[PDB]
Structure 1
Amino acid sequence: SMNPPPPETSNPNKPKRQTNQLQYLLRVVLKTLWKHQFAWPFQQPVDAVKLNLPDYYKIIKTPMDMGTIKKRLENNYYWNAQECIQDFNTMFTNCYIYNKPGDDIVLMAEALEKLFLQKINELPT
């Protein structure tokens, strides 16, 4: 089979707000990870057709990526900062579920996760 539609990035039924935390998550946390040497494979949904991963969406039923997170931030999709942190954790955990220890892509996820945790540590109050 092919790819699912990507995660929703807009909900017109959801109220919106801007906050110091949500702004930092886009401008500091997401920007930093995005510009990292290992970011590209995480900048859009996993495309199982192009990567030839016919079991990807059999194993992964809650896909997430930084392209989606970026759009969710830009669209003010997130009301709670926790929702965004969750999405970043889902993204890493997926990489660890599907792939094997020591795989290039696992090593890249580990580095991005380490940096994420360094940046989240400085979330403003």
Structure 2
Amino acid sequence: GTLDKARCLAFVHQLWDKDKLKMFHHPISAAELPDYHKVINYPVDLSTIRQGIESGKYDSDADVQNAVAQMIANALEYNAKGTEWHQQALSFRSIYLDVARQCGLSVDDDAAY
């Protein structure tokens, strides 16, 4: 599986308030970063995720967590180790599962990115 929109939207909102660099808020424009789409095959961002939960494009809580996982992995792949953005992405990788759990989502610890 069921998509819990309340718990998934909460989850997204929490990740929104913790994104101090606003690096996850919006899709990366090719006008700003023309190499981005050459490097990243599956762009995802918290606005698209929000829209996808609202419209029921996501089948389950788990797909929502995977979309957030994809989002973080994109940032860790695209950004250079050491930069503020790579550090914020590393921080996001280490906390997002506890943000999910704090919003009452079930987390498969062994399987999760």
TM above 0.5, yes or no, is yes
Which ranges in structure 2 are unaligned for 5 or more consecutive residues? 107-113
Residues 27-66 of structure 1 show CA distances to partners (whole Å, capped at 9, x for unaligned) of: 2x1111112252622111111312xx32211111111111
Larger radius of gyration: 1
RMSD: 2.2
1:94 aligns with 74
C-alpha distance in 1, partners of 2:50/2:82?
28
How many residues align? The count is 105
> For the structure 1 residues 59 and 89, does the alpha-carbon distance in structure 2 shift closer, same or farther, using more than 3 Å as the test?
same
Distance 1:112 1:83 in 2: 17
2:23 maps to which of 41, 44, 58: 41
Render the CA deviation track for 1:68-113: whole Å, top value 9, x for unaligned. 1111112222221111111000000011111111111111222333
CA distance 1:124–1:96, shift in 2 (3 Å): closer
Give the counterpart of 1:78 among 55, 58, 68: 58
Q: Do the aligned residues in 2 keep the contact of 1:33 with 1:39 (CA within 8 Å)?
A: no
* Separation (CA, whole Å) in 1 of partners of 2:18 and 2:68: 15
1:25-64 map, 5 Å: 25-27=8-10, 29-38=11-20, 40-50=22-32, 53-64=33-44
- Percent of aligned pairs with the same amino acid: 24
CA contact 2:43–2:74 (8 Å) conserved in 1 = yes
Answer yes or no: is the 8 Å Cα contact 1:33–1:116 preserved in 2: yes
Unaligned runs of 5+ in 1: 1-17
